[PDB]
Amino acid sequence: FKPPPRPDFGTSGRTIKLQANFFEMDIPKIDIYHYELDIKPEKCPRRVNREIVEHMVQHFKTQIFGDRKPVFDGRKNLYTAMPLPIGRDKVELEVTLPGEKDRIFKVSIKWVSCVSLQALHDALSGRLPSVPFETIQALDVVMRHLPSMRYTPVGRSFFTASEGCSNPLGGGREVWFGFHQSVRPSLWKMMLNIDVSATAFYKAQPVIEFVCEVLDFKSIEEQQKPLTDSQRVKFTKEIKGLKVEITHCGKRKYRVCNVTRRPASHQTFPLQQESGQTVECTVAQYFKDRHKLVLRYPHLPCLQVGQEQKHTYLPLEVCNIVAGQRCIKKLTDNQTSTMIRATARSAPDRQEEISKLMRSADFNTDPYVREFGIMVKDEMTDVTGRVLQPPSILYGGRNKAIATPVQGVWDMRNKQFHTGIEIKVWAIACFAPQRQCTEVHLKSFTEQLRKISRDAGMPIQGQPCFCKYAQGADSVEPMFRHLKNTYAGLQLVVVILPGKTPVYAEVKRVGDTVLGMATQCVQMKNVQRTTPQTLSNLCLKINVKLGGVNNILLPQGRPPVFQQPVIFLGADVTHPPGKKPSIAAVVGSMDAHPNRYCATVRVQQHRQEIIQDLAAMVRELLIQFYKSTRFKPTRIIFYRDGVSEGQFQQVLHHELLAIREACIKLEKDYQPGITFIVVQKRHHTRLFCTDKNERVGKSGNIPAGTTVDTKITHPTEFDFYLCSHAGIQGTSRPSHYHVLWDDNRFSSDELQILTYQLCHTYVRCTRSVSIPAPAYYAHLVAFRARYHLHQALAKAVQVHQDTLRTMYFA
RNA sequence: UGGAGUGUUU
Ligand SMILES: [Mg+2]
């Protein structure tokens, strides 16, 4: 029910000086005051609500508030550093906004609470059990009140349109540069977390031009013909749900709920005439008579806004995309690459950008922050980290080599798989054009693939038993039926694909869920031109797909948790961007290495973070563990990815109980110790080497193994940061781990070391990964269920029995 | 789809 306290502080690893983007806050012990604001209408946007409260405090300067500068959260929560003359008596007041008839707003104020700040600092010293959230969020409201007025808020972030501060991405989208801000508690002090942030937005422009950027028109006049049944639906997918503003009447905002089939010249709506009889009138005709405006593009469709039942249709030429709309739809591959290139900063560069943000923010001169008597240190918090020692990786073959990770990396030169697979029969299914992928390309691809295979301990015996061409979606299952039907011991089928093709999704649906054949796809370009490293990495994926063991942790280097049988679980849920369902995935370890993992997946409610069917999922994973090892886990280690702090209790409640439920349903008195660990990549905590000498790579990031659990972590609970991976490009994201439950009384060191070692068991690469393999595999499983496409959906994701005990998701 | 890591009133 309640997260355990920090047991101790880790001492493993060599110290290292670090700086964090957490800026110390000096907070007075005063007693701040809380008021509620019932604003009528109660639906108004936060943005208007802030204007209301703005003029409301200006208008009633002498009556109510005098000279005090209160802070407003945008909804109905006002704070003051001094008591107001309200005196707990509800006071109904009036507010008038300079409108277009002007607007009138009814506002009422009342004292509701007496937030104590001294009650926070003691909680920061472990004095109290928990930390009061209402006081933390009260400070947050103070620190972001001014940013929320002068910038565009987006979650905890702030953006604007200064000097462009954006790069184009195509398709009507651009990436804006802003900054994140949050108030967070730590031991003995409150911290202000500041970071740069960049998110994708829809360019503000006329919809006509949006229709050009979407689709692909160098100029609208090139399409003087009603949009095809294809251009129309693509455009519908992009603009649906976006805000638009009128540019002809008297601006005015609307939400697009659909795009009409007909053009404006023929799209009609019922118009009631003076006499009371209703008649059908075209949008073009109505814009002629009413607004005296001949549509320039009457052959184009209309934007239906408002309720889908009502018939509010707007021509494209009178609408603009409203500025400041965060793009929440999936970005095209080319769009994300542009965003990645545009937003990647080295560690030293990002550190400076944060320092610049602090200078321009100048919190120590913000009137509202000064009003509440708060101070924000200008220097980054100093932290001592620890570089945990990596584990040794044991290989096999004849040289059974022991690799030693260096800066989060190692290779397989002069090393072979731990238990490699001997492969005799295997087919090639080249779905790419023979012209680009000629028989010479296949022969040399094969030739060099077998050379790399035998060098790694996975010898590919002889030539492929089969090698033919094909194309089309419907050509897979018939050919796959044949392949299994006519080849004894068919182990692996290599598939060649051009670029982004729908053959991949169905090649997996058939090989994973229907016939159950291990498949390995590979792009055409990686056939015409082959590299040893690419061939080597390719071999990692296919050895495990056939039950191999690429390597294992050096057994004697493991933490004592491996004394008794133990199962490691990873859990993740991937959500769509209304009818699409969420996909829950839970994987479990099936040996003591731990290397092999069995997967469970479920389709559940749209955007439900809670794993609904977790108990059933855990149950079958425990059975498979018993069937694979003939042991019953004495401990269950549960790595749960992607849960914000605001959902710890909800997930802890349902999912911790579900795990317990699966144990006792198997066996009344089976009570293994559970450890529940939330793993989070989606945060803005950033660590930088204080000494240049400790920087790693061209990015200058902290080294793999860097661990922090002292000054920026929870004042009482069991949490820590572990940057287990090597920063390649940009600035490393240190993974955060929060222990919500622990029956096994883990020490700080053993859990940190265990977590670190688990990041070295990821079989797809000879590198330490940013999260433990179980959590990573869980993400891959759910991703694979997406390519697999309520009763029918569950079976589209249900996996074939033969491929129910292998690592098909690799 | 070799891989990791980097940003997310009509
Ligand atoms: Mg997730």
Numbering used by the authors: 23 to 122, 124 to 273, 276 to 602, 606 to 817, 839 to 859
What does the paper say about this structure?
Argonaute (AGO) proteins use microRNAs (miRNAs) and small interfering RNAs (siRNAs) as guides to regulate gene expression in plants and animals. AGO proteins use small RNA guides to identify complementary sites in transcripts targeted for silencing or repression. AGO proteins create the seed region by pre‐organizing guide nucleotides g2–g7 in a helical conformation, thereby lowering the entropic cost of initiating target binding (Wang et al, 2008; Parker et al, 2009; Schirle & MacRae, 2012). Here, we show that this major functional distinction depends on a minor structural difference between plant and animal AGO proteins: a 9‐amino acid loop in the PIWI domain.
For direct comparison, we crystallized and determined the 2.5 Å resolution structure of wild‐type HsAGO2 bound to miR‐122 side‐by‐side with the mutant complex. In contrast to the HsAGO2 + At‐loop mutant, there is no contiguous electron density corresponding to the center of the wild‐type HsAGO2 PIWI loop (residues 603–606 are disordered), and no interactions between the PIWI loop and L2 loop are observed. In animal AGOs, the affinity of the seed region for targets is quite high, with dissociation constants typically in the subnanomolar range (Wee et al, 2012; Salomon et al, 2015; Jouravleva et al, 2022). Superposition of wild‐type HsAGO2 (gray) and the HsAGO2 + At‐loop mutant (colored) crystal structures reveals nearly identical structures. Notably, target affinities of HsAGO2 + At‐loop varied over 1,000‐fold between the 2–8 target and the 2–21 target. This dynamic range is two orders of magnitude greater than the ninefold difference observed for the corresponding target affinities of wild‐type HsAGO2.
